[PDB]
Each structure stands twice: as structure tokens, then as C-alpha cells.
């Protein structure tokens, strides 16, 4: 399957017009991974930093492309994005003000991304771990090394740990390559195709736990593991073939169950204690309201909050507005914090009060934007 990218351009901190800030271009929910993301100043291309390819639960990809600084003095900035799902490159300009609408547990995840031979310019194998959506480990088929993605990961883990997993990943990389070939032979096609794996567990706020192991082919769910019944789910006749093979090995299934239920949860708690400083902190949001003519729409921004769990909506006198509204979703700030936003198109009438409702610590925060 092929899914068009969602794009949002915004600033790390609220622009002071005299104060250099970070321009961000966030591209998410796209597939395949092939992506061209450029930042533009008045139409010209600018030197910008790009994050490692990251993976979501739905098998899509996302990237944060940021610029060194944007003093923002009487200029016009935008973002250019080229993708296989776009004929003409989509351009999104940065405004003083779409998509979104997606909307306190802890989890650990490990992702794999295979790319059918040849390389196609992209690394054929990639593996990255996440805890609470925080990057921790990074491996790829180019540089075959372990590589911690967090400071508190590398500090609390000896060199013998990374040495051991740098060897395992090389083994898993090769096995992944073989399964990718086998699939293409089963689907009776060749050329560019992708192979993805996601495993992990999560620890719920009350002490409950769950775990999952899943596989995707070309962005679509392929094989899904049930650790309770010790059986694999297949949504395709071709996926059914692997199902019958994998289920034939009982020791493997049992092994998966134990890791997800016992081993994984242990790794999660261990990592949480390591990053206790970063993960257990909470920084309140800074709300900002603005308006743009042409009939007019209102904007509400919430800056620099952690964790990402947040709820934000517009109100009218003083009830919530479900009509003519947009949700930015949770966006990476780049500081390790996050920011979002919500907009409303107004038929203003007379004497109506419009105010922004935000709940973070909950801790309900309301800012009155506008009234006739």
C-alpha cells in the first residue's frame, strides 16, 4: 500500500522576530519510506537537519526536518515535499498562525524495516528501539553497529552489551533478508517492496501489562501474533503460508510468549529507571491565541509541554465546538517537548465568547480568545 505524507510547518518556540528560533517541518504517516523534504526561504533552498527514519504502530514513517535558525524578520518560509504519492511536490508555507485529528502508560517497542534487493539507495535493513516513543537504539545495514539513541542509554549500558547486540542484529538482518526474498517469491512479484516487524510491550498505569509481535508487507498488516492462544493471524492467503510454518514450531511460539510477558516487561522497567529524569518529568504548556482575516478563523497553540498526553479544543459560550474545527495532532517540538494546535472558522454573530480549553496536568487551562 502507498500512503501520502501529512505535512506541518511550525516553529520550536514562539517567534520573537528578533530571536532566532528553530523552523520545523514534520512529515508523518507516509509510505514507502522514500521522501524528499526541503525547507525554503522565499523559494530558495536552505541547509536543514533531518532526523533518523522513525516508525509508527500503523507501519507508516515520520521525520523531523529542522533548520538551524529562523530569526523571522519580514520573510517567507515554506517546506517542499516530494513523494511517490504526489505528482507535483506539495508545498506548505509557514504562517504566523492542516491534517491531524489523531488525538499515561509506558511501553517498549522494537521495529524492523526491510527493503527488497537491491538497496534502492536506502539501507536494506534498519532496527530502532523506542521507550515511551523515545528513541533508544539504532542499527542499520550500512554501519552494522549498536549505537544508543539516548544519553541515559549509553551511560547505563556497558560496551559489552552493545557488542553483543551488534552481533545479534547482523544475524537478524540476514534472516530478515531471506524472509523478504521468500515473500516476494510467494507473492510472485519482484522489484521494490518493503518488510516490517514490530515487537514490544507496555506497562499500564495500574500495573497491567501487554505485549505484541506483528509483521507488515508493503505497509499492510501481514502476520499478527496472539501470545494467549499461541497462534498467528493471517489476513492474506500468502501470509497464511508462513502462518502454517511458524505455528509448526511450538518452541518458538512459547519462546515469544515468555519474552513478551516476562523478559520484555523487565527490560522496560530497567530502561525507565535509567531515564527516570527525562521520562517522569512534566512541563506545562504555554497557550497562545491568534486570529487571521478571511469569514475569519481563530488559532490556539500550546508550546513546550511534556508528556505528549494533552487535550485541546475551542469553546463557545462556553461549550465545545465540533463544527468547522481542525486538530494539529501532537507535534515534536525538538526540545524533547511537544506542541499542538486547534482552529475554528467563525460565523461570529453577536456577543459570543470564544476561548481555548487545554488540559495537560488537568489542571484545566482556559484562555479567552475573542468576543464581539
Amino acid at each position: 500500500i502507498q500512503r501520502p505524507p501529512k505535512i506541518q510547518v511550525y516553529s520550536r518556540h514562539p517567534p520573537e522576530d528578533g530571536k532566532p528560533n528553530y523552523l520545523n517541518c514534520y512529515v508523518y504517516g507516509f509510505h514507502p519510506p522514500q521522501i524528499e523534504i526541503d525547507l525554503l526561504k522565499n523559494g530558495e533552498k536552505i541547509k536543514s537537519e533531518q532526523s533518523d527514519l522513525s516508525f509508527s504502530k500503523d507501519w507508516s514513517f515520520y521525520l523531523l526536518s529542522h533548520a538551524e535558525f529562523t530569526p523571522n524578520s519580514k520573510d517567507q518560509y515554506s517546506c517542499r515535499v516530494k513523494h511517490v504519492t504526489l505528482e507535483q511536490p506539495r508545498i506548505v508555507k509557514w504562517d504566523r498562525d492542516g491534517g491531524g485529528s489523531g488525538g499515561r502508560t509506558h511501553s517498549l517497542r522494537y521495529f524492523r524495516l526491510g527493503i527488497s534487493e537491491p538497496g534502492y539507495g536506502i539501507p536494506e535493513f534498519i532496527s530502532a528501539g523506542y521507550v515511551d516513543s523515545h528513541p533508544i537504539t539504532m542499527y542499520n545495514s550500512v554501519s552494522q553497529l549498536k549505537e544508543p539513541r539516548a544519553l541515559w542509554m549509553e551511560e547505563n549500558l556497558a560496551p559489552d552489551h552493545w557488542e553483543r547486540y551488534t552481533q545479534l542484529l547482523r544475524g537478524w538482518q540476514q534472516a530478515f533478508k531471506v524472509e523478504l526474498k521468500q515473500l516476494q517469491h510467494h507473492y510472485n512479484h519482484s522489484g521494490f517492496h518493503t518488510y516490517q516487524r514490530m515487537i514490544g510491550c507496555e506497562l499500564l498505569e495500574d500495573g497491567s501489562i501487554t505485549g505484541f509481535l506483528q509483521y507488515a508487507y508493503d505497509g499492510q498488516d501481514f502476520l499478527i501474533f496472539n501470545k494467549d492462544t499461541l497462534s498467528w493471524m493471517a489476513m492474506d492467503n500468502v501470509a497464511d503460508i508462513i502462518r502454517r510454518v511458524w505455528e509448526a514450531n511450538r518452541h518458538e511460539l512459547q519462546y515469544q510468549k515468555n519474552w513478551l510477558e516476562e523478559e520484555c516487561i523487565a527490560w522496560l522497567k530497567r530502561f525507565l529507571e535509567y531515564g527516570k529524569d527525562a521520562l517522569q518529568r512534566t512541563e506545562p504548556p504555554k497557550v497562545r491565541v491568534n486570529h487571521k482575516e478571511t469569514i475569519t478563523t481563530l488559532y490556539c497553540r500550546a508550546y513546550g509541554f511534556y508528556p505528549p498526553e494533552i487535550s485541546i479544543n475551542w469553546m463557545k459560550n462556553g461549550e465545545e465546538i465540533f463544527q468547522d474545527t481542525d486538530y494539529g495532532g501532537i507535534l515534536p517540538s525538538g526540545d524533547g517537548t511537544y506542541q499542538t494546535w486547534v482552529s475554528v472558522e467563525l460565523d461570529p454573530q453577536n456577543g459570543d465568547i470564544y476561548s481555548c480549553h487545554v488540559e495537560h496536568g488537568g489542571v484545566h487551562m482556559v484562555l479567552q480568545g475573542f468576543q464581539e
Epitope: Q144, G171, H251, A266
Partner: antibody, heavy 107, light 114 residues
Framework: NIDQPTEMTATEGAIVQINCTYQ??????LFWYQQHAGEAPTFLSY??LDGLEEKGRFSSFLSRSKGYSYLLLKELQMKDSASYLC??????????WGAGTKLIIKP | AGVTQTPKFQVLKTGQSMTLQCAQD?????MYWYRQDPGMGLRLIYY???????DKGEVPNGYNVSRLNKREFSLRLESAAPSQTSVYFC?????????????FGEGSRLTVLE
Amino acid sequence: NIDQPTEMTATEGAIVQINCTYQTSGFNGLFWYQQHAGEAPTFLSYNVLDGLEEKGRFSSFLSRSKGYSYLLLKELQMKDSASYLCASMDSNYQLIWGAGTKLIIKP
Amino acid sequence: AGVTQTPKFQVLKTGQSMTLQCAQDMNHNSMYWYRQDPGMGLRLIYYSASEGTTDKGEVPNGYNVSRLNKREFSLRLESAAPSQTSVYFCASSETDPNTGELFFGEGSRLTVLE
């Protein structure tokens, strides 16, 4: 660390139980190998979840809470005389081998 | 099929170089080299997850290793020592982690005399 009885003697046709205790960081499984004298070991059983795994005359029990396992040999034949190796996996997938239990079967 | 290992017997004067041959017909990925001694569970000297990569084990000291093909993993000791007298097992598994069923070579009997 992993421990099992050094030597065990039993008569042919009888039943025998070889205990194996292990203390490791994590647990990814526990293996039993049979190794005849002067020969290469052979895979016997693999246990991860708590319970009993029976194959023919052989059965392998595991307790993850107790860190305990036993290989249970029923209806002992002469060919059963061998060394029986016990091994388990760490949190990392490394394998720890116990010095086996030499089983001597008297006719 | 199975893991093939040679030689099965060697006597060496200390200081001599010798290499043990191991080949796997099972199209596996991971390969190991084990040393078995009396009163001790098997120890891993060296292993490889797949072809093109190898890494030291519990007791790498005095040993080297190489993966030629996906089929072959050879154990090399450049300078023989009396402490290296043992029965060397070359083992092969389809993939790491899961060793079982782990396949062992016939075994290689090594005695090093001054």
C-alpha cells in the same frame, strides 16, 4: 551459575530424575542434551513456559519461579547411559552450560 | 546432512599451529566453537551470527576464527599450549538465539605435549 548432580546410577528398566537448578539474569529457556561417551551431544528438550514437556520415555519439567528443571527418564534402557547436559539462556541470548550428570545404567 | 568436523584426533607439540575444519550442510546461519573439559559444562571460545561476522566467546584466549562460506567455520590456534588439550566441538544452529536443536560436530580430540 547452573548446577546438576555429577553422577547417578540406576538399574535397567527403572525410572530416574535428574534435577537442574539455575540462577541467571534473565531467562530465555532451558535445554537438555544427551551426550553418549566419546560422542557429540544431541538435543533432547526445550522448556520456556512453566510445565511439563513429554517426549516418548523422556519428560522435562520447568519451574521459572523456582529456577528448577528435571529430566525424567522412564523405563531405562541400556543405551540411556550417557551424560545429560543442562543449559539455559540469559537475558541476553547467551547460553550457560552445566557440567552434566553422568548416568550409569546397570543391566 | 549434519555438521562435519575434522580432524577427530590430533597430537601436537607445544608451539605448533593447527586448524580445525567445520562445515554445515543444513544451510544454517549461526556457528559456534565449543571446548569440552572434565568437570565443566561446555564453554564457547568463538561464534558467528552469520557469514561475514564473528565474535569472541567466554574463552577466546589463545584462539582465532574465520568464516569462509555460510557453510564453513574454522578454528585456528597459532601457538599450541598444553592448557589447550581438550575435545573441541563445532556446533551449528539455524539462527541465534535459539540454539536447540543445536547441532554438534563429531568432536575433535586434541592433546598437546611438550
